[PDB]
Design a protein around this nucleic acid. Structure first.
Lengths: 100, 50, 154, 77, 104, 131
RNA sequence: UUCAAAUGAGAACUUUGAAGACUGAAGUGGGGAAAGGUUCCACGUCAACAGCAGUUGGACGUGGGUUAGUCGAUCCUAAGA
RNA sequence: AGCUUAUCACCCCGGAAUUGGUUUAUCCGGAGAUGGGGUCUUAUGGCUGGAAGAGGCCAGCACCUUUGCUGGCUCCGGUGC
RNA sequence: GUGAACAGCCUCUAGUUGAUAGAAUAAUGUAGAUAAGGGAAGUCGGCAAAAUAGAUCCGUAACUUCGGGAUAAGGAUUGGCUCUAAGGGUCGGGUACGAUCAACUU
RNA sequence: AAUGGAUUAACGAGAUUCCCACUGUCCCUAUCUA
């Protein structure tokens, strides 16, 4: 175990070239972290309830603007040159109809 | 040259407005023999000599 | 999804180079909607773009190698590659040694240790040699004052 | 900016009919060993410059804020 | 001259979750704190007390808050409690512990 | 084979070796020959100022004063302390002629040893009195 | 130079992350004078061009952009015109 | 911006062989040295006003949000061919 | 950081990671090397390469416009570690010291 | 013989000869890398 913890830490660090990413600004998933305390012998039902609370908070209410336009897309799309309305693409301002 | 004269800057303005392709409605006129802009200028290709 | 626009722009916001900003690969649909510096301020502080703190350039060997240099190690003939004059010039040694021999005589003359006439003989013999260092001069003052006593007693 | 020692000279300046605004700033500093005592700074905006007034006391600072004219627009911090 | 400073540690949030215990932590200080060299060379220069969420250290010796964070990251690495416990100052010379962001 | 080892250890540029030098110190007659060589034109110090330990001629009597006070010459003093490693040491290691080997080690412990140390004591007695 | 992912009809070459290296501060860094004249930035987009490739670009199409009583010019005289 | 800080040079008292003062570099003194006391130039530094309210480093809450909010700490020295 | 050094080699801030790529490892090339024994017999010709190289101590010829020649030539030495010795500053003495502080040089 | 001649220290990416040191130039070719 003392050699594997060294041989695992060889792939992890790479301190000489760039950096170790800061753990304070990175975020953990429940994911990998729930398996780690099992190998130490700690229980998870004390920590499982905190996941059960906040996942009851985040879930979706589906407000009215997400109702009609879930599949509906490109409401009055732009032109061939991609210009705005008040932008005056000087090639196509001559002929108004698109067949010309 | 970033310290240019107004005599020099007055001619860059004419060179910018001549830097455009031909309008799409002149393609359609009667007896149009004009096809492409031929006095068109690039900065990488041809220097305009002040 | 080209993100060079937000790569350059986040380096301007945080104030570190482009080699230090960090865009997460997971939220690559949220970063592409940001096209302004007002969005990148919000995208930093909620935990999407971070700073990547400085690559370590330790000096624990330099503080150790220079520590042995205080004790007189790594100083044989093999470690020297410049002359004596380049390592420590012969004028820098003189300026140190001669300004020692002046301001000792400045503070013996003002303390009454030595009269002003015998000061002016030891002043010019300090300018030439026959005073090797500070201890070598104080013995000559004692030999001068005892022989001034010896002439006075007889 | 200028620093004023006197208080009597300072009351000439809030009445000069050129000064329209002022501000009152409270600091928290330290003496030699002592205590953390508050320190005030009265500022009056002239046309040419900004006159300030440092009072270390909190007792005289309590008095002078009353001594300001009512027409002068005084700002707190 | 040698006025002692009180340093307080709050271990509550990983104590209540059960991944941490203060009991082995309080013993871990008192032998590992070094005074002028050797471990255990302290005689009445430091005192360690614990409560269950509060670990209290009073030292008249050369003992600084930078070194107090040095010993606890030793202890959170031996128990493999790093990656999930950080040591945070709340006010001057008053400290506590926490987790990291577990959230998905 | 290499570059540096060929420059110094060819057959042309071979030094004397450690075997013969122990023989020169071991008696009092060969010491007085080498300290008092007849002067020769084809030799660097004109056949004077010869060190016996390092088989090496010195240019000047000044160059013996600075040679004896060096870490190079304090190899060869420390090198010649013990039994000089003949062929007989290598044969005894395989199980071959112990009694030829052990009798020579018996003589270096008894006879040849303190005769050598009473010669190297007199060289420091002589090379300090003349230098 | 390499692995995964994203994008795309199509990736040795594009973007992010992971990792490996270099210029090593008389730099492959940060600013200018001469000269160039929009190349700067965004949106769209690949027939030609970038001696391979291309979804990328100093390319093509349409636009956006340079704010002064104090920095310069303006004024002064030099060799000279 | 206000107060304060100087090598040089100057002023007054004083009158020097037992020549003295002084630079790393031998230069000055009866055309007045050393020494006691003074004046100026403000290069440059110090305190304060500008000015902590800014900026920097953190922690705690908020929240699709415009994105805000609330606390801290921002201190004290050392050396140089 | 090494060093006499803005030499050369290595790293932090900042910046690039661009120059057509894959697979095999014949000759002849281009660029760079090492060779037993002999040591210019090669060749128009020691071309080219090798050898010497920094620093400290010792030592140093004819010749001469006395300044040079001169780093003349020729020798001894150079790591690591533990030490010793020398070389300083600011203070308190009435009309000989002691403390304290700090540098890389032999 | 100022069409300038003799001499000579120092200096030279100038021209020529030899001596020590040294070595694949050579006897005589072999091998490794990009």
């Amino acid at each position: 175990r003392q050699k594997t913890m060294i041989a695992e830490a060889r792939n992890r660090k790479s301190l000489k070239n760039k950096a170790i990413m800061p753990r304070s600004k990175l975020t953990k998933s429940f994911g990998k972290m729930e398996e780690h305390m099992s190998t130490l012998g700690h229980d998870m039902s004390a920590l499982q309830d905190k996941q059960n609370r906040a996942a009851r908070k985040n879930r979706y209410v589906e407000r009215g603007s997400d109702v009609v336009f879930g599949d509906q897309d490109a409401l009055t799309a732009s032109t061939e040159n991609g210009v705005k309305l008040r932008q005056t693409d000087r090639l196509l301002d001559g002929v108004a109809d698109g067949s010309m | 040259a970033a310290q240019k004269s107004f005599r020099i800057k007055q001619k860059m303005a004419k060179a910018k407005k001549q830097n455009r392709p031909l309008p799409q409605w002149i393609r359609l006129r009667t007896n149009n023999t004009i096809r492409y802009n031929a006095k068109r200028r690039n900065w990488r290709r041809t220097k305009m000599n002040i | 999804a080209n993100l060079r626009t937000q790569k350059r722009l986040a380096a301007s916001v945080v104030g570190v180079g482009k080699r230090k900003v960090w865009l997460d690969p997971n939220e690559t649909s949220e970063i592409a909607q940001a096209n302004s510096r007002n969005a990148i301020r919000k995208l930093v502080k909620n935990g999407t773009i971070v700073k990547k703190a400085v690559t370590v350039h330790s000096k624990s060997r330099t503080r150790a190698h220079a520590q042995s240099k205080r004790e007189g190690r790594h100083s044989g003939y093999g470690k020297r590659k410049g002359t004596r004059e380049a390592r420590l010039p012969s004028q820098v040694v003189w300026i140190r040694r001669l300004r020692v021999l002046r301001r000792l005589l400045a503070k013996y003359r003002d303390a009454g240790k030595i009269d002003k006439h015998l000061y002016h003989v030891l002043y010019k013999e300090s300018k030439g040699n026959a005073f090797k260092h500070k201890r070598a001069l104080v013995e000559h003052i004692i030999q001068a004052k005892a022989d001034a006593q010896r002439e006075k007693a007889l | 900016a200028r620093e004023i020692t006197d208080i009597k000279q300072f009351l000439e300046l809030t009445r000069r009919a050129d000064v329209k605004t002022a501000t009152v700033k409270i600091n928290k500093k330290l003496n030699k060993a002592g205590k953390p005592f508050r320190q005030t700074k009265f500022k009056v905006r002239g046309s040419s410059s900004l006159y300030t007034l440092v009072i270390n006391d909190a007792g005289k600072a309590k008095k002078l804020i009353q001594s300001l004219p009512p027409t002068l627009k005084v700002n707190r911090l | 001259q040698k006025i002692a400073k009180t340093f307080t540690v709050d271990v509550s949030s990983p104590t209540e979750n059960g991944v941490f215990d203060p009991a082995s932590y309080a013993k871990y200080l008192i032998d590992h704190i070094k005074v002028e060299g050797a471990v255990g060379n302290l005689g009445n220069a430091v005192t360690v007390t614990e409560d269950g969420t509060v670990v209290t250290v009073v030292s008249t010796a050369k003992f600084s808050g930078k070194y107090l964070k040095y010993l606890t990251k030793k202890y959170l690495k031996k128990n493999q409690l790093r990656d999930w416990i950080r040591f945070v100052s709340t006010k001057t010379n008053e400290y506590r512990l926490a987790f990291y962001q577990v959230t998905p | 084979m290499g570059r540096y080892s060929v420059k110094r250890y060819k057959t042309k540029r071979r030094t004397r070796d450690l075997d013969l030098i122990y023989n020169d110190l071991s008696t009092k007659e060969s010491v007085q020959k080498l300290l008092n060589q007849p002067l020769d034109e084809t030799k660097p110090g004109l056949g004077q100022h010869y060190c016996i330990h390092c088989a090496k001629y010195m240019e000047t009597a000044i160059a013996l004063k600075t040679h004896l006070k060096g870490k190079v010459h304090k190899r060869r003093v420390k090198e010649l302390r013990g039994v000089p490693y003949t062929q007989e040491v290598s044969d005894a290691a395989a199980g071959y002629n112990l009694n030829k080997f052990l009798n020579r080690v018996q003589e270096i412990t008894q006879s040849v040893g303190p005769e050598k140390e009473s010669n190297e004591a007199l060289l420091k007695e002589h090379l300090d009195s003349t230098l």
